[PDB]
Design a protein around this ligand. Structure first.
Ligand SMILES: CC(=O)N[C@H]1[C@H]([C@H](O)[C@H](O)CO)O[C@@](O[C@H](CO)[C@@H](O)[C@@H]2O[C@@](O[C@H]3[C@@H](O)[C@@H](CO)O[C@H](O[C@H]4[C@H](O)[C@@H](O)[C@H](O)O[C@@H]4CO)[C@@H]3O)(C(=O)O)C[C@H](O)[C@H]2NC(C)=O)(C(=O)O)C[C@@H]1O
Length: 441
């Protein structure tokens, strides 16, 4: 059939956030009780649920009387956007074995041993548990990647999809990719609690917090194609996104990292001069089997509206014309390309920071766009002159300026426009803002 129709008709619960209110929009109108400390934060498309570690931080969904899908052997799928901060080395050793659930249909503290199902976290493990009324439990334990820059439980919004085919297996996917599975054939009736609880339960780390968005449940075990569609469907090209998957913002400091060479940071030669790539320092921990390129080194960039048009908003949308500045010595210097400014083969125009030569035009009108790699939280920057001509997309060129060492220098080139289909390009940028969800060990 139509994947879109199937996806829609199979939805039996779909939490949305409108006007700061969390409710079910599936149609069965499952009642939603939002406790005092359930906070709201930027989500994948609108706002999202943010949970902290205290009794008042929870959201309870009272399943409608028409929704009891976990019937004798009946299939269901759970999907949602998840964001958990990078567990620090100390906390990993500290609370690494502390399994705490974050979403459950189980009713602990009364009876019905382990009720139905749950989504729990243990150190850097994402766990799915299914338990029937006769004891029987099944699980999928996902062990995240060592490299936290590319891990899934390390401060980036990620799409979780767990399908349950009671006639075969249960499968866990992340951003549409299968990453764990378990047989679940032969389970008895799952008699869970009438409430689905969104809450950090049994977590000993008082500082722990997670973020959940678009929590949804389907009455069928989604297949790879439907999952793949559900996933990409949430990616609205409208607003741009920063490294963590949050909406990109104006007048906010961002460190830039080129997707095509993620181990690199951006440095400035001298004010009025060019920028270039640098190897970022690393953090490695063999005992905890954790490692990642550190963040927050290099130049701080700041996006500003070229001309404060129609609205005093702070969200950057694709197509917005902007001005780029780098903060060096507390002062903000504009980023651009001077007329007839030095360039590599008159193609790759070398960018400059704080260029201020008298009588020389400095082209700095830029457009923030999203022209490719929909799944990656990356942005492209298009530079124009003053006569609406494209001076190219911001990227890098590996050359030598004067007698300086051979470097990967930031430039503006139109060559990019003829390779937008490539996997890895060079004009793709990560905008990294300092976040409490990630501090270098
Ligand atoms: C259209 C146009 O005329 N603009 C030029 C500009 C322009 O002259 C300046 O912006 C005006 O201030 O210069 C461009 O090239 C510059 C050098 O002019 C770059 O190559 C940058 O050079 C740096 O170091 C040189 C400068 O300090 C110059 C100043 O004159 O002195 C040395 O170079 C020679 C000079 O070119 C000669 O005039 C002089 O007689 O002899 C010296 C040495 O024998 C320095 O090496 C600089 O400007 O700081 C170092 C920078 O890293 C370098 N930047 C780049 C991107 O290469 C320009 O791009 O601005 C060329 C442009 O067409």
């Amino acid at each position: 059939e139509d994947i879109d129709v199937i996806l829609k008709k199979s939805t039996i619960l779909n939490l949305d956030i409108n006007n700061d209110i969390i409710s079910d929009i599936s149609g069965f109108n499952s009642s939603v009780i939002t406790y005092p400390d359930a906070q709201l934060v930027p989500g994948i498309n609108g706002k999202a649920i943010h949970l902290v570690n205290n009794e008042s931080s929870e959201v309870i969904v009272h399943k409608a009387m028409d929704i009891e899908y976990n019937d004798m052997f009946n299939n269901f799928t759970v999907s949602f956007w998840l964001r958990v901060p990078k567990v620090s080395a100390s906390h990993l050793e500290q609370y690494g074995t502390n399994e705490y659930s974050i979403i459950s249909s189980m009713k602990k503290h009364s009876l019905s041993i382990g009720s139905g199902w749950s989504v729990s976290l243990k150190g850097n493990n994402l766990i799915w548990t299914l338990k029937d009324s006769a004891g029987e439990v099944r699980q999928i334990t996902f062990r995240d990647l060592p490299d936290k820059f590319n891990a899934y439980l390390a401060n980036k919004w990620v799409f979780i999809t767990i399908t349950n085919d009671r006639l075969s297996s249960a499968n866990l996917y992340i951003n549409g990719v299968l990453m764990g599975s378990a047989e679940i054939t032969g389970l008895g009736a799952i008699r869970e609690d009438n409430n689905i609880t969104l809450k950090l339960d049994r977590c000993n780390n008082n500082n722990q917090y997670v973020s959940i968005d678009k929590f949804r449940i389907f009455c069928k075990a989604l297949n790879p194609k439907e999952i793949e569609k559900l996933y990409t469907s949430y990616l609205s090209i409208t607003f741009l996104r920063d490294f963590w998957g949050n909406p990109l913002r104006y007048d906010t400091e961002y460190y830039l990292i080129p997707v095509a060479s993620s181990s690199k940071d951006v440095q400035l030669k001298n004010i009025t001069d060019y920028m270039y790539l640098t190897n970022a320092p690393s953090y490695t921990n063999g005992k905890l089997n954790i490692y990642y390129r550190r963040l927050y080194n290099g130049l701080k960039f700041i996006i500003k509206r070229y001309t404060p048009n129609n609205e005093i908003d702070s969200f950057v949308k694709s197509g917005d014309f902007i001005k780029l500045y780098v903060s060096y010595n507390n002062n903000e210097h504009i980023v651009g390309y001077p007329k007839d400014g030095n360039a590599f083969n008159n193609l790759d125009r070398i960018l400059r920071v704080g260029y201020n030569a008298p009588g020389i035009p400095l082209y700095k009108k830029m457009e923030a766009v999203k022209l490719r790699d929909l799944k990656t939280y990356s942005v492209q920057l298009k530079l124009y002159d003053d006569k609406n001509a494209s001076l190219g997309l911001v990227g890098t060129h590996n050359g030598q300026i004067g007698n300086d060492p051979n470097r990967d220098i930031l430039i503006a080139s139109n060559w990019y426009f003829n390779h937008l289909k490539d996997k890895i390009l060079g004009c793709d940028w990560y905008f990294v803002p300092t976040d409490e969800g990630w501090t270098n060990d």
